[model samples]
Target: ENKVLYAYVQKDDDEITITPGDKISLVARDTGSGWTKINNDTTGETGLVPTTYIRI
Candidate 1:
């Protein structure tokens, strides 16, 4: 049997506004679980990418 895992952003409440070159922290959740802090900085990248691209 093979076990498949899945993750998704359940909710996000970004109160911090950012401008060009501004540093920010990304908080993400997975399938109703608690939020996980992504290690990499996704400042300029798209907010969400394909699940295969994420590590945490």
Candidate 2:
């Protein structure tokens, strides 16, 4: 239900910025767009993140 981010992401795009080692919840795994949807557990925010950004 939770995964840790290994890399940092910026909020420049239509995605949320996440810090390395931060915990997040997987919301959607199949985007078919090379992106995965996740929710930031700590902030309660949701956005698209790179599938390779976190450990599956």
Candidate 3:
């Protein structure tokens, strides 16, 4: 399944600022942390984002 970001999310130290309506790849998932790894195709930057912010 493909994932798309539907809400505005800010970048943290090890995360990326993902804009709304952006398509991203699911890289990894943190079991209970509420965060997941993502790959930004537009910028080629991979980082963590909130699991709640992305939609499949």
User: CA lDDT of each candidate?
Assistant: 0.34, 0.71, 0.73
Q: Least lDDT summed over 10 consecutive residues: which range in candidate 2?
A: 1-10
Report clashes for each candidate as comma-separated counts: 0, 0, 0
- Please give, for residues 1-56, the per-residue lDDT of candidate 3 as tens digits: 56565554555778876776576787887789988888878667788888887764
Ranking by TM-score: 3, 2, 1
Candidate 1 TM-score over all chains jointly: 0.24
Model 2 residue pairs with clashes: none
Ranking by lDDT: 3, 2, 1
Model 1 lDDT tens row, 1-56: 11113434323442222333333344464443333333224344324323332443
Distance from true position, residue 21, model 1, in Å?
Answer: 19
Query: Compared to the true structure, candidate 3 yields what TM-score?
Result: 0.72
TM-score each candidate: 0.24, 0.68, 0.72
Residue-wise C-alpha lDDT for candidate 2, range 1-56, written one tens digit per residue? 45665655656465776666677887789558977778877666788877877765
